[PDB]
Structures are given as structure tokens and as C-alpha cells.
Design an enzyme around this catalytic site. Structure first.
Site, PDB file in Angstrom:
ATOM      1  N   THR A  67      -2.677   6.297  10.725  1.00  0.00           N
ATOM      2  CA  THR A  67      -3.732   6.648   9.728  1.00  0.00           C
ATOM      3  C   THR A  67      -4.231   5.443   8.939  1.00  0.00           C
ATOM      4  O   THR A  67      -4.959   5.541   7.919  1.00  0.00           O
ATOM      5  CB  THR A  67      -3.286   7.866   8.952  1.00  0.00           C
ATOM      6  OG1 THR A  67      -2.036   7.511   8.235  1.00  0.00           O
ATOM      7  CG2 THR A  67      -3.054   9.098   9.881  1.00  0.00           C
ATOM      8  N   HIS A  68      -3.743   4.285   9.345  1.00  0.00           N
ATOM      9  CA  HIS A  68      -4.232   3.044   8.691  1.00  0.00           C
ATOM     10  C   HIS A  68      -4.044   1.958   9.733  1.00  0.00           C
ATOM     11  O   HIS A  68      -3.342   2.184  10.709  1.00  0.00           O
ATOM     12  CB  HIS A  68      -3.488   2.758   7.363  1.00  0.00           C
ATOM     13  CG  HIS A  68      -2.048   2.640   7.574  1.00  0.00           C
ATOM     14  ND1 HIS A  68      -1.475   1.487   8.100  1.00  0.00           N
ATOM     15  CD2 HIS A  68      -1.003   3.446   7.322  1.00  0.00           C
ATOM     16  CE1 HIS A  68      -0.162   1.631   8.172  1.00  0.00           C
ATOM     17  NE2 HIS A  68       0.132   2.775   7.661  1.00  0.00           N
ATOM     18  N   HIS A 124       0.825  -1.192   0.000  1.00  0.00           N
ATOM     19  CA  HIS A 124       0.000   0.000   0.000  1.00  0.00           C
ATOM     20  C   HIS A 124       0.859   1.241   0.000  1.00  0.00           C
ATOM     21  O   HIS A 124       0.379   2.323  -0.303  1.00  0.00           O
ATOM     22  CB  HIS A 124      -0.972   0.072   1.241  1.00  0.00           C
ATOM     23  CG  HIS A 124      -0.225  -0.033   2.526  1.00  0.00           C
ATOM     24  ND1 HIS A 124       0.206   1.072   3.246  1.00  0.00           N
ATOM     25  CD2 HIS A 124       0.171  -1.115   3.247  1.00  0.00           C
ATOM     26  CE1 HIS A 124       0.811   0.678   4.326  1.00  0.00           C
ATOM     27  NE2 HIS A 124       0.813  -0.646   4.361  1.00  0.00           N
ATOM     28  N   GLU A 131      -3.053  13.714   3.925  1.00  0.00           N
ATOM     29  CA  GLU A 131      -3.963  13.138   4.913  1.00  0.00           C
ATOM     30  C   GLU A 131      -4.566  14.249   5.735  1.00  0.00           C
ATOM     31  O   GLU A 131      -5.762  14.455   5.810  1.00  0.00           O
ATOM     32  CB  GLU A 131      -3.234  12.113   5.783  1.00  0.00           C
ATOM     33  CG  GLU A 131      -2.881  10.900   4.868  1.00  0.00           C
ATOM     34  CD  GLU A 131      -2.868   9.601   5.573  1.00  0.00           C
ATOM     35  OE1 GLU A 131      -3.591   8.697   5.199  1.00  0.00           O
ATOM     36  OE2 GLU A 131      -2.085   9.550   6.618  1.00  0.00           O
ATOM     37  N   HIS A 148       2.353   9.655   1.836  1.00  0.00           N
ATOM     38  CA  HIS A 148       0.962   9.492   1.442  1.00  0.00           C
ATOM     39  C   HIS A 148       0.725  10.410   0.248  1.00  0.00           C
ATOM     40  O   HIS A 148       1.134  11.574   0.215  1.00  0.00           O
ATOM     41  CB  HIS A 148      -0.081   9.765   2.559  1.00  0.00           C
ATOM     42  CG  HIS A 148       0.149   8.881   3.772  1.00  0.00           C
ATOM     43  ND1 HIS A 148      -0.585   7.806   4.038  1.00  0.00           N
ATOM     44  CD2 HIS A 148       1.017   8.973   4.775  1.00  0.00           C
ATOM     45  CE1 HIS A 148      -0.194   7.226   5.183  1.00  0.00           C
ATOM     46  NE2 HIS A 148       0.749   7.963   5.653  1.00  0.00           N
ATOM     47  N   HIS A 155       7.690   7.774   5.567  1.00  0.00           N
ATOM     48  CA  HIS A 155       6.948   7.272   4.405  1.00  0.00           C
ATOM     49  C   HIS A 155       6.131   8.435   3.972  1.00  0.00           C
ATOM     50  O   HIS A 155       6.116   9.491   4.601  1.00  0.00           O
ATOM     51  CB  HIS A 155       6.053   6.030   4.733  1.00  0.00           C
ATOM     52  CG  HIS A 155       5.033   6.276   5.798  1.00  0.00           C
ATOM     53  ND1 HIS A 155       5.245   5.914   7.104  1.00  0.00           N
ATOM     54  CD2 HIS A 155       3.865   6.913   5.761  1.00  0.00           C
ATOM     55  CE1 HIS A 155       4.204   6.286   7.838  1.00  0.00           C
ATOM     56  NE2 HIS A 155       3.331   6.899   7.063  1.00  0.00           N
ATOM     57  N   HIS A 193       8.177   2.086   2.633  1.00  0.00           N
ATOM     58  CA  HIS A 193       8.785   2.608   3.877  1.00  0.00           C
ATOM     59  C   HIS A 193      10.276   2.646   3.780  1.00  0.00           C
ATOM     60  O   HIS A 193      10.898   1.796   3.173  1.00  0.00           O
ATOM     61  CB  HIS A 193       8.392   1.783   5.122  1.00  0.00           C
ATOM     62  CG  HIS A 193       6.961   1.747   5.359  1.00  0.00           C
ATOM     63  ND1 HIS A 193       6.361   0.828   6.217  1.00  0.00           N
ATOM     64  CD2 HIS A 193       5.912   2.494   4.908  1.00  0.00           C
ATOM     65  CE1 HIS A 193       5.095   0.974   6.252  1.00  0.00           C
ATOM     66  NE2 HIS A 193       4.817   1.997   5.491  1.00  0.00           N
ATOM     67  N   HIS A 215       5.463  11.637   6.415  1.00  0.00           N
ATOM     68  CA  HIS A 215       5.372  11.209   7.863  1.00  0.00           C
ATOM     69  C   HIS A 215       6.702  10.632   8.341  1.00  0.00           C
ATOM     70  O   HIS A 215       7.232   9.668   7.736  1.00  0.00           O
ATOM     71  CB  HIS A 215       4.304  10.111   8.107  1.00  0.00           C
ATOM     72  CG  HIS A 215       2.901  10.581   7.950  1.00  0.00           C
ATOM     73  ND1 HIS A 215       1.828   9.689   7.720  1.00  0.00           N
ATOM     74  CD2 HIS A 215       2.361  11.817   7.957  1.00  0.00           C
ATOM     75  CE1 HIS A 215       0.717  10.498   7.613  1.00  0.00           C
ATOM     76  NE2 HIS A 215       1.075  11.722   7.718  1.00  0.00           N
TER      77      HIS A 215
HETATM   78 ZN   LIG Z   1       1.668   7.827   7.359  1.00  0.00          ZN
END
Ligand SMILES: [Zn+2]
Length: 256
Positions: free
Chosen positions: A195-196, A60, A102, A92, A90, A63, A115
Site C-alpha cells: 500500500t506504499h 512513516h 486502508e 495504518h 504493522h 514495524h 497488516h
Molecule cells: Zn500495511
């Protein structure tokens, strides 16, 4: 779980009820309701480039992980009374180049989000253990605005050619992530979560007031990464940003 619609953000609660928790992230930062905390200290990041270890395609997202057996790279200051050990950074992004962050500011969604995550080395022994505690994680979120290409992203972009598909890893060394941060580190902070999935409400967010740039073609590169394992049909990493969640009476404090 994923970001598609069959297993996406709107379906996560079915498996992770904390998805509906009271300290979910991301959130919309309404600059007019932010509380200025005079107790906040400037954030001080001190990272050692030698702790950079690997880049990995997790399906997804990708990293960039760091060695986390010592306090060589830490985050201090901010709202913290103890040091947080750097473990990863990582990004988004979204399917479009202008809407993929996000966190949002005054309801404004930026192109992407950086992040930088750290765990509470002082209060806990392992990331595993700290990951579920309220004071467990500290994450710096940096908003990315599509515009001029960001030359500080080049090593990351170049590395992506070696981890095109899920589960691929490549050594990624000698990199100091502090080079990705904005000029000024004035920030907003609030207690939130991952966030996931697992969606643990163990994060102390530090959202930088200042954004950084990225170009269209730089973001197109991320979306060019594949979510499938090598050999299978191509399934592009089109987006991985979660929609904003209700504040539920949390207070966003500002460093200024
Ligand atoms: Zn993140």
C-alpha cells in the site's frame, strides 16, 4: 515519499508509476459483488512467539519484525497451496480516530488497520526476491473499529516509548501476533499490492470479515510517534493510510 501532500499518495505515481497499476491496494470491498469460492480453505496461522525480534520506527510507521530464516511461523490455507513465512506486522491509522483504515467495506472506512505480512518461502528464497513476484507476499488485513480499548495491543503500545523517533529500534520478543486477530477468520481475498512504495503488485490479500477494537487513546499513542530523527523538531506520525484504488476488474472472493 510520505503521506503529506508534497509526497503523499496522490503524488506517488510521479516516482512509482505502478501506483496507477491494475492490481493496486487498498480497495473498497463491496460485499454485494464478492464471489464465494468453495475452493477456499480456512486460513491456518501457526506462529512461534520466539520468532518475534524487533520493533522499529521507519519514519512513516513502526514495524514489528520477525525472524524469517525458517518456517516456524507460517500462514497456510486460504487460497494458498504453499506456506507463507511471517516477517512482520504493522498498522495504518489516520489523523482522526474514526477514519484511518486502508481497506474499506461497502465504502465504510474504519479507524485503523492491522497488516500481518508473510512471503512465499516455498517458491522463493528471500523476502527481497519474493517481494516483487505476483505470488510473493500474503498479507492479513484486520479492520480496527474505535470503541473499547483492546488490551491485546498493550505490549505494542508499551514498546513505542522506546522507538519514539525515526530509526530507533528495540528488541521486541516473545509475541504471537495471532493474538491480534479476530475470533473468526472468515475472509475476503484478492490479488493486490503493497500500500506504499515500492507498491509492488505481489500481494495476496486476506481481509478478515471481523474487525477488532482499539480505543481513542490507544490510537492517539501511535500518532504520538515521531517521524523525525532524535534531536530535530517534532513531526508527529499523524497518518499513513493510502486511499482506495480502482478494482480494475479484480474479483474479491469470500471464504463464506
Ligand atoms: Zn500495511
Amino acid at each position: 515519499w510520505g503521506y503529506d501532500d508534497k509526497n503523499g499518495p496522490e503524488q506517488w505515481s510521479k516516482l512509482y508509476p505502478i501506483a496507477n497499476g491494475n492490481n493496486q491496494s487498498p480497495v473498497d470491498i463491496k460485499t454485494s459483488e464478492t464471489k464465494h469460492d468453495t475452493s477456499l480453505k480456512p486460513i491456518s496461522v501457526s506462529y512461534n512467539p520466539a520468532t518475534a525480534k524487533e520493533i522499529i520506527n521507519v519514519g512513516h510507521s513502526f514495524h514489528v519484525n520477525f525472524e524469517d530464516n525458517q518456517d516456524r511461523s507460517v500462514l497456510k490455507g486460504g487460497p494458498f497451496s504453499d506456506s507463507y513465512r511471517l516477517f512482520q506486522f504493522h498498522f495504518h491509522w489516520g489523523s482522526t480516530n474514526e477514519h484511518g483504515s486502508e481497506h474499506t467495506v461497502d465504502g465504510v472506512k474504519y479507524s485503523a488497520e492491522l497488516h500481518v505480512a508473510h512471503w512465499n518461502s516455498a517458491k522463493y528464497s528471500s523476502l527481497a526476491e519474493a517481494a516483487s513476484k505476483a505470488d510473493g507476499l500474503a498479507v492479513i488485513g484486520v479492520l480496527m473499529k474505535v470503541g473499547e480499548a483492546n488490551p491485546k495491543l498493550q505490549k505494542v503500545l508499551d514498546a513505542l516509548q522506546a522507538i519514539k523517533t525515526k530509526g530507533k529500534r528495540a528488541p521486541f520478543t516473545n509475541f504471537d501476533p495471532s493474538t491480534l486477530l479476530p475470533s473468526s477468520l472468515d475472509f475476503w481475498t484478492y490479488p493486490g499490492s503493497l500500500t506504499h512504495p515500492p507498491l509492488y503488485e505481489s500481494v495476496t490479500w486476506i481481509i478478515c470479515k471481523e474487525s477488532i477494537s482499539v480505543s481513542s487513546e490507544q490510537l492517539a499513542q501511535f500518532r504520538s510517534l515521531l517521524s523525525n530523527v532524535e534531536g530535530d523538531n517534532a513531526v508527529p506520525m499523524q497518518h499513513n493510510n493510502r486511499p482506495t484504488q480502482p478494482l480494475k476488474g479484480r474479483t474479491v472472493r469470500a471464504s463464506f
